[PDB]
Design a protein around this ligand. Sequence first.
Ligand SMILES: *Cc1c(COP(=O)(O)O)cnc(C)c1O
Ligand SMILES: *Cc1c(COP(=O)(O)O)cnc(C)c1O
Lengths: 468, 466
Amino acid sequence: MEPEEYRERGREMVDYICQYLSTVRERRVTPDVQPGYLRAQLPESAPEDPDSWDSIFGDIERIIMPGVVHWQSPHMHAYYPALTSWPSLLGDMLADAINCLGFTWASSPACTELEMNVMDWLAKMLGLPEHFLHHHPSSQGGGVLQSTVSESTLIALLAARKNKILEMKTSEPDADESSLNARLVAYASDQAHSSVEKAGLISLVKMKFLPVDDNFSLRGEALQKAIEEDKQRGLVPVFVCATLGTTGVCAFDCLSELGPICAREGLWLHIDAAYAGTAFLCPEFRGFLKGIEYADSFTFNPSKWMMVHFDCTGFWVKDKYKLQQTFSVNPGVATDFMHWQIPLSRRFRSVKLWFVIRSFGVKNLQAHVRHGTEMAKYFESLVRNDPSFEIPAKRHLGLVVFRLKGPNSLTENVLKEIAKAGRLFLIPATIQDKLIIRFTVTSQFTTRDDILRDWNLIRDAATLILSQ
Amino acid sequence: SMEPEEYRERGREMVDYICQYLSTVRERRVTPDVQPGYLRAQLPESAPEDPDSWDSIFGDIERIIMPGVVHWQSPHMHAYYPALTSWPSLLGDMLADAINCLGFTWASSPACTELEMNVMDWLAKMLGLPEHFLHHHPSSQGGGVLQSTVSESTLIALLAARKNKILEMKTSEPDADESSLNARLVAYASDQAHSSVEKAGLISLVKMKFLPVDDNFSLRGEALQKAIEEDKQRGLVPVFVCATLGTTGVCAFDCLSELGPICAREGLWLHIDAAYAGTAFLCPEFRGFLKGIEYADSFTFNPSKWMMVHFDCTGFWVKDKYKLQQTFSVNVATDFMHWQIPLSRRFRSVKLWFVIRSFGVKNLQAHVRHGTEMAKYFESLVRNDPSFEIPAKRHLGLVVFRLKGPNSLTENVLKEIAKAGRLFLIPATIQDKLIIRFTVTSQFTTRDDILRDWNLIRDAATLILS
Ligand SMILES: *Cc1c(COP(=O)(O)O)cnc(C)c1O
Ligand SMILES: *Cc1c(COP(=O)(O)O)cnc(C)c1O
């Protein structure tokens, strides 16, 4: 492609993007396609000669879009949000042209140096302890960007089990690290995201999921019981994942109770706040963040609610030496992030994060969180006024869970019917034995009209199923 | 809060900037003259409470960011291996970042999965990989998935290998803790292997043994067989081999025709690290290094290095997708969350699709052949100067050389070059010898860029040798 033929085609892509994101409401959020739909539409081999750019651009709507789930539609309500924004897009265009790798400070200093400063910005913005900042006198920890909360949670466990094994060796210097690993046990809520179980599966660390209270919150008494029972069998408690904003119903583990136990029992305390983390930009939601000073590590996704496009996960550790001894065999003033992560290579993610924090500024990020929560409150009040439906868990943020009164099958068929037109996107979840509809406020541009429109389609589907 | 007509103008602004930057990159000091700590002083202490201007933000690119940048897109970048961008790759990711769909399951965005599957079948064919690596070959149990790095792809391969062997050892030891069984395992690579292999061992608590190489720095069948027998005798269970095609140091090739049959016979997961060299397998004449590929359980390369797709974009192929999914799940649509460490993944296949379509196989092949020709030319210039030796053969785009005599001569040549930073070079070591690695990077590298860079190097040598 000629620098001439990149200017025009670059321009045509900025126009398309501006059109696509502005008119996203006009899209069927769910694509009407079956598995394998794409193969017969694509040649069986890569083209030998250049395909014309017109043909490639023409294929965006002709073959790509019909298979897309439109995650930027206000009628997307499944999972948790993944929000893009105009600034985020502008940052990555820059980063991807540079295309530098920041494994060491030396490999591209700016890649490392912007990230350290912007991560300090973001720790402040969320009200995290000062011991999670790079540039604080007493602090010996810091923030690093990761691709997902999933890997962040794995890294915390990896750092946790490594530090404990090194400690266990000083008694048994002839024992094999893997053999010592056998004795370890890690805990989370039974509401924990599947990333916790997968971290266990990958690390070969025994994982035990602890029962929750009526608000689906893990309590200090559940952890304290488990610790005593496991130690009784000669198991070695090593790790606790506390979830601030569970996937299912957006419950909050009681951190003020879990934090002090982990500090007393010397257990690595990891905070998974993937979604709810963005809410901590607002001091009025920071209630759930009480006992944070006990956290050994904390993670949240700007890539869920804070309007940074994926990938962009914040990961803070208290002790950057324990993190780096996980990844280095060999334990100067320059920070090398390749020792803070699984891979070697990393890219210049910090630009897009920087542009978003700057382009919006703090108060507008805090107002986005409040407006999204407001739209969830409006949706809640609609559900709660209709006695066909029940809400089995409290709405703290932008997620409302509900179901038809009666058997699971009614709620199942409601989802099935909503799915036929796919004018809003919903995913069947479960708490205990009860099937629920999760309704997540996503788009920053969500209106009260969007919410009522979506509620009416749910009501229409409920009315049709309850008439069979 | 921005607005559509505001975004429109700044996109046009960012487009022109990037055309200028990539177009003029030769004019940049390749490495920056900066000290660690340098950037904090020029940033506020805290995030701005209200929106900053876009002339302010766009200004800070040349003002605050580009000073601290190593220009990886410079023809005068010759350190590590290439990480090549191109206009089609940038345009593909523009679209992907706008859609911002996650593809953890087929359902979460069908296109994100199906475009990846078909383009990964495209790429297997282009590299001349076995058909048992294709999603859509009728007799395949395997397929390709995009990952972020070769590093993580190698970790995954080792995790999949150790999990499969532990599940098997369980059959005759039902009471054995998985972690206890893992203690018996041993994995192998070349002592020329990328640090990612050592790192995968440290993460997984799997014993890693690095094996000696021949005079071409190639790992040979005899060394692996000898290791396996000595380790089996001591109660260790061989589980994994990483065979490297294009080593970091000198771009050597492990003897895959020997290693393959030993791995199949002895029950070792055979993982191929072709991070850099992989892109060469686009050209049939380099597929000699691929001999024995049929024995491989997994294969990984970085389009992200030499194929002009910007980072991140690593291809990872497995023969048995079920052994992969058993690694990642405690217990028709393909769900890529079971082929990787994390749950979430983004629409990386758009930039790959765009690159492969915008160039065609022919132009990508001409790109590889041209980088190789420029390396061959540089080689001829070094070989003609008897002050210099070439202690390992040049198969692709990397030439390694040094001054004859002690390492200080070569060290002082590198120190002399690094004063003006006009070309970025990183030293390696093969045994008792400091070497200069000279990697042909940019797809726009000409003979003049090579001769320019050679002349700086020979000048540095003339100076140091008197
Ligand atoms: C979404 C989510 C995660 C993991 O998301 P990633 O794709 O791994 O970044 C983890 N925990 C909770 C509570 C989540 O909602
Ligand atoms: C560059 C390189 C790697 C590392 O690649 P990442 O994608 O950064 O992990 C691994 N192996 C070899 C042979 C390499 O040349």
